[PDB]
Enzyme design. Structure first.
Site, mmCIF file in Angstrom:
data_model
loop_
_atom_site.group_PDB
_atom_site.id
_atom_site.type_symbol
_atom_site.label_atom_id
_atom_site.label_comp_id
_atom_site.label_asym_id
_atom_site.label_seq_id
_atom_site.Cartn_x
_atom_site.Cartn_y
_atom_site.Cartn_z
ATOM 1 N N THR A 1 0.823 -1.214 0.000
ATOM 2 C CA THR A 1 0.000 0.000 0.000
ATOM 3 C C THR A 1 0.859 1.267 0.000
ATOM 4 O O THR A 1 0.553 2.227 -0.705
ATOM 5 C CB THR A 1 -0.942 0.036 1.224
ATOM 6 O OG1 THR A 1 -1.711 -1.171 1.277
ATOM 7 C CG2 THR A 1 -1.889 1.238 1.164
ATOM 8 N N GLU B 1 11.400 27.640 3.250
ATOM 9 C CA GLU B 1 12.766 28.119 3.482
ATOM 10 C C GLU B 1 13.746 26.952 3.452
ATOM 11 O O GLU B 1 14.804 27.020 2.812
ATOM 12 C CB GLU B 1 12.903 28.823 4.842
ATOM 13 C CG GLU B 1 12.326 30.229 4.913
ATOM 14 C CD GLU B 1 12.578 30.927 6.244
ATOM 15 O OE1 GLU B 1 13.376 30.427 7.065
ATOM 16 O OE2 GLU B 1 11.976 31.999 6.466
#
Ligand SMILES: Nc1nc2c(ncn2[C@@H]2O[C@H](COP(=O)(O)CP(=O)(O)OP(=O)(O)O)[C@@H](O)[C@H]2O)c(=O)[nH]1
Ligand SMILES: Nc1nc2c(ncn2[C@@H]2O[C@H](COP(=O)(O)OP(=O)(O)OP(=O)(O)O)[C@@H](O)[C@H]2O)c(=O)[nH]1
Ligand SMILES: Nc1nc2c(ncn2[C@@H]2O[C@H](COP(=O)(O)OP(=O)(O)OP(=O)(O)O)[C@@H](O)[C@H]2O)c(=O)[nH]1
Ligand SMILES: [Mg+2]
Ligand SMILES: [Mg+2]
Ligand SMILES: [Mg+2]
Lengths: 428, 426, 428
Positions: C136, C245
């Site tokens: 999964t 950032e």
């Protein structure tokens, strides 16, 4: 600001070290918990708020001797990162310690050392306790010593080694061990101090009046001596002797760096009341053949240099007189090229005494580390012992099995032989 | 007007300074905080020479303290008048010499000196007209010798026209502290020949002698020695700090007692020295002061002064004295000892008189002599060096710092030459 | 104002996530009920009056792992709309997760995501927890990732993936899974962080002194690391590092966006008393080869960029010194084109500790996310592993059955190979 890193190698190193640690603790008023209810900054680093951890590394290839510390009273003083443990022992063999087993443990410890060493800022020098006759104390130390010249080099090193006795020695293969491990000591170690158990035993019997001594009595004695080296750092006397200074003073040549120690006074609690401890008397005691730490002969020997270190109630006025008197005497004698041969240290702090200690509480104490031609004769018989053992290839096959090539032996004996003549050359 | 910044170095020099400074403060009347409590007005007119008047009437010592380790600077702060010193002026390293001049002069000291070379400049700027630098250190070890020596020569580049004083402590044969004294001494002296204007050679062996017999002290310490030594320093610069009937500053003294370029080493002496017993019964008058002063055993240099002649002789008297009493005594002495003064320099005497005495004592005498008996001090050292250097002993510590075996013989030769200059005119 | 959406895919994601949630709850003083007896606004939205629901979506194809959360202590924290459940599992297969089963569930979740995403105003970026080796966690994630570039694109994404180990790995077909799922990661994912269980295990053993660890001990460790990324958002330090950032800083090129994490200090409760935690020491700990989160070699590698994030008692004065020291050292080394290579973050808030936690309560903590050529070598052996498996068409028929065409394999291997050289090119 100043700092120094202690190392303990083998069983002997461990055993010695504990006593020393205890002594240190006693000195600065610290219980085993590590919280004191400054001067101590050298050996102890204050962790957070009231946790004094020692500058120490205990190496051992067995678990037995290290786990003795972990279960006892000083369980709180150390943590498992500081205490390194092997699996298979050195088994009283140099070859097992250096080549086969020595690769795995040293790696672990070097990182640890770095971690400890980079933490402190003012590195004075190293201390390495071991025995020449021991397996781990010879094979690992040599490796370790070799390693330490790469990272540091000029930064100073000391080692207080248990020298083997010709008569009272507790292992058969000791001769071999000594001869091999001295190859690394000449190149790497800056100055190594030497003590013999037999010598100690006599002292214990005659002066302390205890005819049943065991290792715990010797360890204590050793610790005092050790302290007397480092006492100049941790306390501010009128005159001081740092380690570098000491090195500069006592060690004249590149080949010779093997002075021997002595300690006085060492006497019983009842004997202290009668015996008026004068300065002159204590000075004399250091030059007596009876009180020497190695089986040697001061009568045959000549002192090139020797560094006195007083602690307690001392002033320079009578020290000078004492110095003069010794100079005047002809039983003590020096080499022609050295007119002035002493280095004198003083300290205000009195030498402490351990709870239930064999030594009496005293005002004054002395420690003379003398470089001399007396210890030159000590290896002449060692060589003889070694040679006989080697002559018929006795005990050799074990060594061979551990990866020791046959030429190694040749290398170490010849070198030793060469060294013995150096002393003679110097003293002519 | 006319200021003198003070420099210190080494374990002993620093200690000396610590006491010297205290004594000077006592003399003027400065307290631990710095605020003035004195009564006599003439202490405040020449306060400027040794004390910058800072904000709030708190005076501060014009000083530089140097060391290659932080150990000695701990006890200086905790002691008396440690709070008067400025925090800025303390300089110290983290390494240490290790009783080696080779390490001290080239590698270890040259990294520290660049801080001091900037600090001294500021001090110089501060005063109106600096007249000279006082320097206090030892030649026995590596820390006080190597650093100070390194420093003093670089001052001559910036300030060539200023007087240079040096208060040293040379080694003794009997009371030998370190093993490598001959080495250090031999090399440290070399640079002090051409760079210095005057030097006072003190020796502890003589100090001990002075203490045991004269002062009758049962338990001497280094403190006593420090106190003694400091007294001498106080004596030489008394004429600057106080008015007098006949004033004599440093430059004048230098001019008078240094006849030749290379012969400027002096020997200090102090009087009156009295015990608790001799305080009562000794009649302190000028003649008495005189006679004691010229005794061979009263000197601070451990030699025999009467083996040779004094080239020059000067004295600095303190307290009010009649000049016919003062000036006659010297003459009388000269007359007496016609075999112990040089004949081709007739009238060897120099005198100076101060009106303000030391607190407690009525009178005092500081004796600075220049003699040919300094040969005995150096000769022994030379011999020792020879003994050492023959076998190349203790050499790998010095050779490790990049010094050739020729470089020893270069300085040695110089030393020998210097020694000879005394035996030229004896 | 600021906000971020967490996603949890597969069993691993679920398992990890619970611990993280718990940690978060502990941090802001919220019991499992969801009512607190501001800073928390990012992860928790206050419903009505005193009901804090998390920004979360748990996807799973089984019911077992999701129903573990529904029956436990945190039953009150979530509701069935947030917790999505399949019927047939991925069965440790990429092909089952992406093509066959993946069509039905994703549709349900996208709407849910939208509902959650449009509710918050200040979307910083996504977080997606999974494993490459999982069924999964590979097949669905790839699909999901693909989907998310349509609706958002520029809005940032992160994923903390469990990388497979060469030695200690708990599934046979893992090689295949990794190779396929990395095809979508290169195009879509902005920066993916990688952790290996084996690496963690060593850390758990050596430093924490617990020789019997299970997943719950690893999960906790992971959660701290996760927090250390998001700690800059939720608390106001002197200097701050937002996600955008960080992305700007650490990621230089379009191809390379695979930095690796590290966390220190991690030590026992008894070890905290002795060990004086200094800043320098902790800095060092991040650069040690022993404390790395992936099986790699920093000695061979070169750091292009690495972002330090401190939380607790820290100030810039000694941080600078620490930075300098590392630069000075040559064991750590950088690429020629990057002279200045650090991004430094600070936070006042101390890192919390879980009730009955293995980690000790500490003042300081560090987290370095380093982009490097060390992790470039990690896939060289993976490829080898994969290749051998593929060479004889092993396990292929299953994949084929689920609708995987044979060229897919060709596509994913070649691409991977191409990528391995990119690192080399950059580092020349
Ligand atoms: N008048 C005084 N003389 C002293 C004192 N301490 C030492 N000495 C004398 O000075 C000599 C030693 O001088 P130092 O200790 O200053 C040597 P130095 O500091 O320059 O080098 P290191 O010891 O390596 O730092 C020695 O021969 C002593 O007789 C003191 O307090 N007062
Ligand atoms: N003075 C003193 N000597 C000791 C002590 N313990 C051992 N020795 C000496 O050291 C030698 C034995 O060395 P060990 O330290 O036991 O040997 P090792 O280097 O630990 O090697 P292994 O025993 O194989 O681990 C003997 O000659 C002893 O006389 C001690 O506590 N005090
Ligand atoms: N660190 C850590 N790793 C885990 C954990 N659970 C599983 N893993 C790793 O993830 C891999 C197994 O992936 P799973 O998440 O079980 O597989 P999946 O994607 O859920 O697919 P299905 O199991 O078929 O539903 C193994 O290699 C495990 O080592 C956990 O709690 N912590
Ligand atoms: Mg053993
Ligand atoms: Mg000194
Ligand atoms: Mg599953």
């Amino acid at each position: 600001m100043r700092e120094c890193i202690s190392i303990h190698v083998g069983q002997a190193g461990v055993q010695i070290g504990n006593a020393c640690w205890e002594l240190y603790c006693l000195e600065h008023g610290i219980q085993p918990d590590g919280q004191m209810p400054d001067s101590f900054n050298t050996f102890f680093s204050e962790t957070g708020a009231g946790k004094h951890v020692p500058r120490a590394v205990f190496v051992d290839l067995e678990p037995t001797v290290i786990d003795e510390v972990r279960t006892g009273t000083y369980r709180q003083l150390f943590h498992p990162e500081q205490l390194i443990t092997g699996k298979e022992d050195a088994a009283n063999n140099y070859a097992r310690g250096h080549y086969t087993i020595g690769k795995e443990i040293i790696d672990l410890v070097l990182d640890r050392i770095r971690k400890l060493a980079d933490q402190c800022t003012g590195l004075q020098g190293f201390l390495v306790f071991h025995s020449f006759g021991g397996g781990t104390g010879s094979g690992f130390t040599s490796l370790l010593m070799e390693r330490l010249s790469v990272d540091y080099g000029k930064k100073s090193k000391l080692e207080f080694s248990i020298y083997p006795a010709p008569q009272v020695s507790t292992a058969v293969v000791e001769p071999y061990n000594s001869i091999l491990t001295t190859h690394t000591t000449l190149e790497h170690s800056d100055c190594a101090f030497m003590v013999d158990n037999e010598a100690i035993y006599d002292i214990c019997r005659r002066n302390l009046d205890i005819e049943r001594p065991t290792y715990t009595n010797l360890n204590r004695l050793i610790s005092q001596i050790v302290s007397s080296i480092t006492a100049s750092l941790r306390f501010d006397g009128a005159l001081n002797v740092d380690l570098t200074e000491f090195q500069t003073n006592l060690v004249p040549y590149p080949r010779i760096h093997f002075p021997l120690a002595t300690y006085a006074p060492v006497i019983s609690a009842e004997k202290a009341y009668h015996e008026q401890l004068s300065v002159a008397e204590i000075t004399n005691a250091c030059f007596e053949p009876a009180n020497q730490m190695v089986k040697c002969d001061p009568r045959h020997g000549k002192y090139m240099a020797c560094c006195l270190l007083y602690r307690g109630d001392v002033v320079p006025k009578d020290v000078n007189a004492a110095i003069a008197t010794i100079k005047t005497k002809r039983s003590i004698q020096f080499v022609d090229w050295c007119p002035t041969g002493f280095k004198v240290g003083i300290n205000y702090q009195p030498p402490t005494v351990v709870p239930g200690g064999d030594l009496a509480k005293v005002q004054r104490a002395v420690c003379m580390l003398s470089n001399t031609t007396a210890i030159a004769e000590a290896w002449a018989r060692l060589d003889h012992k070694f040679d006989l053992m080697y002559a018929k290839r006795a005990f050799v096959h074990w060594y061979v099995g551990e990866g020791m090539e046959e030429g190694e032996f040749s290398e170490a004996r010849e070198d030793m032989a060469a060294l013995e003549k150096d002393y003679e050359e110097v003293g002519v | 007007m006319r200021e003198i910044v003070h420099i210190q170095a080494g374990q002993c020099g620093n200690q000396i300074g610590a006491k010297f400074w205290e004594v000077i403060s006592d003399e003027h009347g400065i307290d631990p905080t710095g605020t003035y409590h004195g009564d006599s007005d003439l202490q405040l007119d020449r306060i400027s020479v040794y004390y910058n008047e800072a904000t709030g009437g708190k005076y501060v010592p014009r000083a530089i303290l140097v060391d290659l380790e932080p150990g000695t600077m701990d006890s200086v702060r905790s002691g008396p008048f440690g709070q008067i010193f400025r925090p800025d002026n303390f300089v110290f390293g983290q390494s240490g010499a290790g009783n080696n001049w080779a390490k001290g002069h080239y590698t270890e000291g040259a990294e520290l000196v660049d801080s001091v070379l900037d600090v001294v400049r500021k001090e110089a700027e501060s005063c109106d007209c600096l007249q000279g630098f006082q320097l206090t250190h030892s030649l026995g070890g590596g820390t006080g010798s190597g650093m100070g020596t390194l420093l003093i020569s670089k001052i001559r580049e910036e300030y060539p026209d200023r007087i240079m004083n040096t208060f040293s402590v040379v080694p003794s044969p009997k009371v030998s502290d370190t093993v490598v004294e001959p080495y250090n001494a031999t090399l440290s002296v070399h640079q002090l020949v051409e760079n210095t204007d005057e030097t006072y050679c003190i020796d502890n062996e003589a100090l001990y002698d002075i203490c045991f017999r004269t002062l009758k002290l049962t338990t001497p310490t280094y403190g006593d020695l420090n106190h003694l030594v400091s007294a001498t320093m106080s004596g030489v610069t008394t004429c600057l700090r106080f008015p007098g009937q006949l004033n004599a500053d440093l430059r004048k003294l230098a001019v008078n007692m240094v006849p030749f370029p290379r012969l400027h080493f002096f020997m200090p002496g102090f009087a009156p020295l009295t015990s608790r017993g001799s305080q009562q019964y000794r009649a302190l008058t000028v003649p008495e002061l005189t006679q004691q002063v010229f005794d061979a055993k009263n000197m601070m240099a451990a030699c025999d002064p009467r083996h040779g002649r004094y080239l020059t002789v000067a004295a600095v008297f303190r307290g009010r004295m009649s000049m016919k009493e003062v000036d006659e005594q010297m003459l009388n002495v000269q007359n007496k000892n016609s075999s112990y003064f040089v004949e081709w320099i007739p009238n060897n005497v120099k005198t100076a008189v101060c009106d303000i005495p030391p607190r407690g004592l009525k009178m005092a005498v500081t004796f600075i002599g220049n003699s040919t008996a300094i040969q005995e001090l150096f000769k022994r050292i030379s011999e020792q060096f020879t003994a050492m250097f023959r076998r190349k002993a203790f050499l790998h510590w010095y050779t490790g710092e990049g010094m050739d075996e020729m470089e020893f013989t270069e300085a040695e030769s110089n030393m020998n030459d210097l020694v000879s200059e005394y035996q030229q005119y004896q």
